[PDB]
Amino acid sequence: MQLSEEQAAVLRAVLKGQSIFFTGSAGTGKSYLLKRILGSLPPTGTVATASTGVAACHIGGTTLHAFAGIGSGQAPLAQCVALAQRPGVRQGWLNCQRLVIDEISMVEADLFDKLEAVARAVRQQNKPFGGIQLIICGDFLQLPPVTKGSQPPRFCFQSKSWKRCVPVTLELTKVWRQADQTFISLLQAVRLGRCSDEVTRQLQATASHKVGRDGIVATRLCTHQDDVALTNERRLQELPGKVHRFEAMDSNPELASTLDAQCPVSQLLQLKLGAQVMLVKNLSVSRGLVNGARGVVVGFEAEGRGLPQVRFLCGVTEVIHADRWTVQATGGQLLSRQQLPLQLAWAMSIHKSQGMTLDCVEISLGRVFASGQAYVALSRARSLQGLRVLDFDPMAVRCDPRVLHFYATLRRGRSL
Amino acid sequence: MQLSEEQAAVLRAVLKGQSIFFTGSAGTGKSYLLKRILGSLPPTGTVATASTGVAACHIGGTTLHAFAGIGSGQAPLAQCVALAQRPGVRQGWLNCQRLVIDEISMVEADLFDKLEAVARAVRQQNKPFGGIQLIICGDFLQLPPVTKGSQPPRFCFQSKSWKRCVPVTLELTKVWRQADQTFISLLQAVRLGRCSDEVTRQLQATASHKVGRDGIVATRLCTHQDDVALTNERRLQELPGKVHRFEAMDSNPELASTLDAQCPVSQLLQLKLGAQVMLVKNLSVSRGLVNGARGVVVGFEAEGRGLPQVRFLCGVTEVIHADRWTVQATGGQLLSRQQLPLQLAWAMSIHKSQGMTLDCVEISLGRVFASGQAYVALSRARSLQGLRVLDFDPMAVRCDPRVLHFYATLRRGRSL
Ligand SMILES: Nc1ncnc2c1ncn2[C@@H]1O[C@H](COP(=O)(O)OP(=O)(O)NP(=O)(O)O)[C@@H](O)[C@H]1O
Ligand SMILES: Nc1ncnc2c1ncn2[C@@H]1O[C@H](COP(=O)(O)OP(=O)(O)NP(=O)(O)O)[C@@H](O)[C@H]1O
Ligand SMILES: [Br-]
Ligand SMILES: [Br-]
Ligand SMILES: [Br-]
Ligand SMILES: [Br-]
Ligand SMILES: [Br-]
Ligand SMILES: [Br-]
Ligand SMILES: [Br-]
Ligand SMILES: [Br-]
Ligand SMILES: [Br-]
Ligand SMILES: [Mg+2]
Ligand SMILES: [Mg+2]
Numbered sequence: 001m002q003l004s005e006e007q008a009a010v011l012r013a014v015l016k017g018q019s020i021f022f023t024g025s026a027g028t029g030k031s032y033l034l035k036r037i038l039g040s041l042p043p044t045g046t047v048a049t050a051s052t053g054v055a056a057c058h059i060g061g062t063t064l065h066a067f068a069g070i071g072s073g074q075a076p077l078a079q080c081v082a083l084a085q086r087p088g089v090r091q092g093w094l095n096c097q098r099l100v101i102d103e104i105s106m107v108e109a110d111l112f113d114k115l116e117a118v119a120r121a122v123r124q125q126n127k128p129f130g131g132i133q134l135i136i137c138g139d140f141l142q143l144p145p146v147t148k149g150s151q152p153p154r155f156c157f158q159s160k161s162w163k164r165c166v167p168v169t170l171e172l173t174k175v176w177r178q179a180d181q182t183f184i185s186l187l188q189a190v191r192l193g194r195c196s197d198e199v200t201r202q203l204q205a206t207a208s209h210k211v212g213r214d215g216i217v218a219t220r221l222c223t224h225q226d227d228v229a230l231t232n233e234r235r236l237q238e239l240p241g242k243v244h245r246f247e248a249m250d251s252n253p254e255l256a257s258t259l260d261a262q263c264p265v266s267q268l269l270q271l272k273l274g275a276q277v278m279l280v281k282n283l284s285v286s287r288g289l290v291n292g293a294r295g296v297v298v299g300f301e302a303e304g305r306g307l308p309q310v311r312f313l314c315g316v317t318e319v320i321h322a323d324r325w326t327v328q329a330t331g332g333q334l335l336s337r338q339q340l341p342l343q344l345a346w347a348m349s350i351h352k353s354q355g356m357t358l359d360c361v362e363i364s365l366g367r368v369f370a371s372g373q374a375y376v377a378l379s380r381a382r383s384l385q386g387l388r389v390l391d392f393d394p395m396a397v398r399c400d401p402r403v404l405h406f407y408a409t410l411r412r413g414r415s416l
Numbered sequence: 417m418q419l420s421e422e423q424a425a426v427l428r429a430v431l432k433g434q435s436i437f438f439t440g441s442a443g444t445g446k447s448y449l450l451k452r453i454l455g456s457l458p459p460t461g462t463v464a465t466a467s468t469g470v471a472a473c474h475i476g477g478t479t480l481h482a483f484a485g486i487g488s489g490q491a492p493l494a495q496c497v498a499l500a501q502r503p504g505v506r507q508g509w510l511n512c513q514r515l516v517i518d519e520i521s522m523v524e525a526d527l528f529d530k531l532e533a534v535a536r537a538v539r540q541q542n543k544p545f546g547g548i549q550l551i552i553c554g555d556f557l558q559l560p561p562v563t564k565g566s567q568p569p570r571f572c573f574q575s576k577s578w579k580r581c582v583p584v585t586l587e588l589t590k591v592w593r594q595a596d597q598t599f600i601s602l603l604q605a606v607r608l609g610r611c612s613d614e615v616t617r618q619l620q621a622t623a624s625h626k627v628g629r630d631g632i633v634a635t636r637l638c639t640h641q642d643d644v645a646l647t648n649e650r651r652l653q654e655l656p657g658k659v660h661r662f663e664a665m666d667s668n669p670e671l672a673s674t675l676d677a678q679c680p681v682s683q684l685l686q687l688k689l690g691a692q693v694m695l696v697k698n699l700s701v702s703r704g705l706v707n708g709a710r711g712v713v714v715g716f717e718a719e720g721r722g723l724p725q726v727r728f729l730c731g732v733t734e735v736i737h738a739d740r741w742t743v744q745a746t747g748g749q750l751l752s753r754q755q756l757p758l759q760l761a762w763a764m765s766i767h768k769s770q771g772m773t774l775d776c777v778e779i780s781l782g783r784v785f786a787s788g789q790a791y792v793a794l795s796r797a798r799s800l801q802g803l804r805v806l807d808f809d810p811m812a813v814r815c816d817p818r819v820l821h822f823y824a825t826l827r828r829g830r831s832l
Contacts, residue, residue, distance in 0.1 A: 305458065326742050
């Protein structure tokens with residue numbers, strides 16, 4: 001694809017060796033541009049990471065936690081430095097010339113501070129972040145920071161080292177995920193916490209949307225995985241068909257926990273006729289069989305493993321064959337899982353949707369959400385006709401004042 | 417694709433739980449059928465192997481050496497059992513219910529005997545091969561057995577435990593790789609050591625073949641990698657263009673040797689305008705961009721890494737982007753390499769062609785070759801007009817008498 005002028009400016013800064021933060025609304029092509037950046041660089045000395053396993057998958061990277069190799073990051077700095085000096089971990093720190101981080105908004109400032117300090121200590125380079133070229137992107141108006149500790153987290157930009165570490169800031173301002181300017185304008189009002197009467201009426205009108213197709217119902221977006229598991233298990237149980245089982249094969253079952261964070265499929269996949277499923281690997285972009293595609297199980301092959309036949313929203317029916325995930329864990333340890341690329345999809349967490357495009361979703365937005373969380377949910381949908389919002393109330397839409405102040409300081413001095 | 421009656425009979429035997437050896441000429445779909453078998457089985461308890469790294473890649477498996485975890489296999493049986501009892505190796509032995517082995521002809525009888533004894537000792541199951549369902553294929557009239565020792569190797573069928581371990585034998589007899597019955601008939605005469613006057617005249621006539629296309633020359637097949645390296649290096653040096661470098665990124669540089677056995681690309685790929693290259697990953701079966709495809713470097717992109725533009729024999733010109741190989745080493749350890757899927761291809765070893773289809777080849781066959789080695793070289797070509805044989809003489813075509821006796825015993829009692 002033709003990069004926009006804005007995307008080309010970011011790639012030019014990266015190839016000049018500039019540390020950069022680039023930002024933009026949901027669906028502006030940040031993660032796409034990271035893939036193009038990675039393609040444009042030598043793989044030696046280039047580390048691709050994201051804040052979360054879900055986001056790391058999108059760019060073929062690892063988690064920032066796995067790269068860093070400092071445990072949780074909560075131990076004292078001396079303990080974290082000793083962990084980073086372990087065989088494998090240390091060579092990763094020493095060999096890293098360029099560190100890509102997607103979905104920065106989930107990285108708390110105290111962790112950024114720890115990583116900056118470990119980088120200097122392991123590399124014995126007394127410069128910001130040990131001299132590593134940082135290539136960071138995300139949207140601070142999307143999912144907020146998380147912490148392995150118990151204190152209220154600070155946004156990454158609050159780190160006293162942030163601006164020294166990413167001195168260049170560029171923006172991507174053209175939304176590609178949604179094609180419809182009416183929906184783009186609605187989403188921007190939500191992102192900024194500006195729900196006019198018109199915006200609220202337009203979101204409430206979606207309560208009547210018939211988002212599915214024959215036999216395909218909406219995926220409910222939920223704030224917590226407990227509620228997702230409960231819903232998917234109950235809806236599967238209620239189907240009359242016999243259960244069909246597909247067991248995953250893992251290279252390292254003792255590290256299942258580490259592999260699950262980054263892999264979107266389960267050790268045990270159970271299906272029935274009528275099961276609502278999400279495809280979680282690109283199979284055929286031309287046929288619309290893409291990551292996030294929704295369908296319904298319409299049959300099982302008679303032969304062999306009895307693989308499922310899935311009809312998708314686009315109208316294509318396909319037998320779904322095995323696939324594989326390889327996850328980079330601590331040091332450079334690699335883990336694999338072989339499984340069908342399907343998950344049950346009556347429900348899905350907002351966190352697990354991070355960075356995805358979806359097209360058949362429902363969400364209840366009648367209570368207080370975390371800063372950015374309602375915006376992330378709404379901005380997954382490719383079009384309004386694939387979105388059903390129940391009980392919408394701008395109480396759900398919250399923007400942390402720290403983030404609005406941050407973006408005002410970013411804007412200061414710019415033409416627009 | 418519709419399996420033949422013969423292929424379906426092998427898959428039926430496998431799904432009944434029968435240990436089996438299935439055999440056939442070059443290009444009869446043995447490795448294809450193994451992929452279909454693997455697709456029809458649960459991945460848990462199913463181990464995909466081949467005798468060589470080259471052959472393991474074709475089926476997405478590991479080497480038999482890597483799975484077994486007994487070192488070279490030359491140590492005493494007690495030391496081999498202790499090696500197989502290591503953490504990770506032992507669980508692979510205990511968890512294995514079905515063991516697939518492609519290209520069995522390279523497995524010497526003494527190693528088969530050691531593996532059968534290790535299987536019983538580690539699993540504490542006093543039945544052939546520890547009770548593992550064996551799914552074995554190959555062609556004993558192809559590449560002969562190799563040994564990590566210094567004694568003349570025995571063919572795998574000479575093992576005293578061979579027939580007890582694979583009690584069922586089935587054949588695939590329809591060649592698919594070549595479509596031309598003239599060429600199929602010539603190849604069968606070579607396989608059986610039956611070079612009539614007419615067979616030798618037809619092979620000698622190919623000395624005049626123009627096998628290339630504009631700017632594309634034949635890959636010379638060589639018996640030894642020393643001669644391949646020398647030829648590819650000298651031909652690259654002689655080109656006038658500046659050198660372009662592409663350095664691989666390996667998860668584990670300390671196990672490069674382990675990764676190279678299975679990976680068809682180098683740590684350092686050097687290219688020039690005019691370089692003769694082989695694509696070594698499927699990119700587009702649709703457009704003829706398949707494993708083994710030959711082309712010529714016609715340009716380098718101006719942007720980013722300066723990726724190569726390659727024109728292939730089929731007429732397609734494509735920019736060649738990074739790819740990745742993941743290799744399963746001992747005890748479930750996974751290794752990766754990121755590199756462009758190109759190798760220099762003025763020359764290639766016969767051993768590295770094992771199990772491949774090629775389209776643009778030359779071979780000098782005026783020397784004594786190993787049993788099956790001339791047949792393997794000749795049977796890589798999809799068609800005769802992609803093959804140039806220099807100095808052909810039947811002295812090059814040898815069939816080990818042990819193998820002809822084995823196949824006579826296999827045939828005994830059959831209808832045909
Ligand atoms: N230059 C471009 N022209 C057209 N489509 C583009 C371009 N760049 C990106 N896209 C498309 O934009 C869509 C969204 O890209 P993506 O990389 O997910 O954006 P993002 O900013 O990372 N989204 P999010 O993670 O939700 O904030 C993808 O389907 C791309 O195919
Ligand atoms: N049933 C089939 N119908 C048509 N083509 C087939 C069929 N089975 C296999 N093929 C084709 O046969 C070709 C050769 O298959 P392959 O699996 O390489 O054979 P092989 O017996 O393993 N060859 P070799 O390893 O050289 O002895 C492939 O291109 C397949 O596409
Ligand atoms: Br410049
Ligand atoms: Br609001
Ligand atoms: Br609906
Ligand atoms: Br979820
Ligand atoms: Br609600
Ligand atoms: Br001993
Ligand atoms: Br002969
Ligand atoms: Br010569
Ligand atoms: Br010769
Ligand atoms: Mg993204
Ligand atoms: Mg084969």
